[PDB]
C-alpha cells in the first residue's frame, strides 16, 4: 500500500461509515482508516518530493496524519460506546482534516 | 459575550475578510473570529437548553466549534504568510461548518 | 488569571483527580483544567516575553495547550463512560505534556 | 517487525543517543526509535494475550506507545535545533515510559 492506496482506503471507509447501520460496521471501518493513516504518515507526497526531508512542509505533512489519527481514535471510542450516530458525525468531521492537508499538499 | 453576540462577530469578520485588501486586515479578523468561536463553544444554545450537558447534542455542538477553530487556524497561517487571496478562500470555505451547525441547532 | 495561577490550577486539579471518589468529581476537575489551559494559552511566558507574538516559539507555545486540551477531552470522555479508574490514569499521563512544554519554555 | 525486535531497536538506539557527542547523530537515532515504537504499537503482548483490544489493559497498553512516540517527537525537535544536551536529557527521560509499561504489562 502506497500513499495513493492509503487514500483510497480512507475515502472508501468514510463512505462505508456514513452508510453504516451498526456500531461494528463503523468500528471496523474506522480501524481500517487508522491503519491507512498510520501507513500514509511516513510517505513523501508528490508535491513535496523535491523539498528537503527535513523541511517545515514535510514536518507539517507528517503532523497532518497525527491529527487525523487522533480524531479517528476519538471516533473509535464513540463507536466502542455503541454511539453509532455520534461516531458517524465524528467521522464526517474528519473531512476538514482531509481537506486541510489536500489544500496544502495535494 | 453570549452566543448570539459571538455569532454576529463571526459573521461581521467574515464580511471583513471578504472585502479585505491586505494580510493584516485578514489576520486581525481571523484573530477576532477565533476568540468568538472559543467563547461560543462554552454556550448552551436555546434549542438545547433542556438537554443534558454530556448529551449527544451538546457534545456535537461543542465539537462543531473545534472544527471551526481548526479551520480558522489554517486560514490564519495563510494570512501570517501574507497569502491574502488564499486566506480569503479558506475563510470562504468556513461557511460549510457554519451551515452544518445551523442546520441542526439554530 | 495569570500564567502562574493557571499552572497552579492545573497542578491542583491533577491532585483532585487522583483523589476522586466518582465520575462527577473527575469531570469537574477536568473541566477546570481545560479552562486553565485555554487561559494560559493566551499568555506570554517569561522565557519568551521579548519574542515576537507570531514567532515560531510563541506559535509552538500556544499549540502545547491545544495538545493538553485534546488530552483533557479524551479523559473527560472516559469519565463520561463511568470509567473513573481509566480517566484517572489518563489524567496522570497528562504529565508528559506538562513536562514537554516545560523543557522548552519554563 | 515483531514486539521483541522493535524493543531491541528501541534499546539499541537509546544507547546510541547516550554515547553520541552531537545533536545530528541523536536526531538520526530518535528517528529510528519513532519508527520502531510505531511498528510495535500494533502488537498484543504475551501478558495480555487473553484480552480483547478494547479492554482497559489493552487500551492502556496502546496509549503507552502514544506517550512514548510523543516524547520521542519532542526529543527529536530538540535534536533538530542542535540541542545535544537537551535532546539527550529528553531521551533518558523516555525510560520512565519504558519502565511504567514494563511494570504493568511485561
Ligand atoms: C479521511 C481523510 C482523507 C481522505 C478521505 C482523503 C482522500 C483522498 C483521495 C480520494 C485522494 C486521491 C484522489 C485525488 O487525488 O483527488 C487523496 C490524495 C491525497 N491525499 Fe488524501 N485524504 C484524506 C486525508 C489526507 C491527509 C490527512 C493528508 C495529509 C496529511 C492527505 C494527503 C494527500 C496527498 C498528498 C494526496 C495526493 C497523493 C498522490 O497524488 O499520490 N490526505 N486523498
Ligand atoms: C463562521 C461560521 C458561522 C457564522 C458566520 C455564524 C453566524 C451566525 C449568525 C449570523 C447567527 C444569527 C443569530 C443571531 O445573531 O441572533 C447565528 C446563530 C446561531 N449559530 Fe452560528 N455562525 C457560524 C458558526 C456556527 C457554528 C459552528 C455553530 C455550532 C457548532 C453555530 C451555532 C449557532 C446557533 C445555535 C445559533 C442560534 C443562536 C441563538 O438563537 O441565540 N454557528 N450564527
Ligand atoms: C497538566 C500539565 C501541567 C502542569 C501540572 C503544570 C504545572 C506548572 C507549575 C506547577 C508551574 C510553576 C508555576 C509557578 O512558577 O508559579 C508551571 C510553570 C510553567 N508552565 Fe506549566 N504545567 C502544565 C502544562 C503546561 C504546558 C502544556 C505548558 C506550555 C504549553 C506550560 C508552560 C509553563 C510555563 C511557560 C511556566 C513558567 C511560568 C512562569 O515562569 O511564569 N505548562 N507549570
Ligand atoms: C524506549 C523505551 C523502551 C525500551 C528501552 C524498551 C525495552 C525493552 C526491551 C529491551 C525488551 C526485551 C526484548 C527482548 O525480548 O529481547 C522489552 C520488552 C517489552 N516491553 Fe519494552 N521498551 C520500551 C518501551 C515500552 C513501552 C512504551 C511499553 C508499553 C507501552 C513496553 C512494553 C513491553 C512489553 C510488554 C515487553 C515484553 C515483550 C515480550 O515478552 O514479548 N515497552 N522492552
Ligand atoms: Ca474503492
Ligand atoms: Ca455530506
Ligand atoms: Ca447579546
Ligand atoms: Ca447582539
Ligand atoms: Ca477521595
Ligand atoms: Ca483526542
Ligand atoms: Cu513536530
Ligand atoms: Cu468529544
Ligand atoms: Cu499553528
Ligand atoms: Cu483511547
From Swiss-Prot, chains A, B, C, D:
It is found in: Periplasm. Coiled coil: none annotated. GO terms for biological process: electron transport chain. GO terms for cellular component: periplasmic space. GO terms for molecular function: electron transfer activity; heme binding; iron ion binding. Belongs to the cytochrome b562 family. Electron-transport protein of unknown function. Monomer. This is Soluble cytochrome b562. The chain holds residues 23 to 128 of 128 of the full protein.
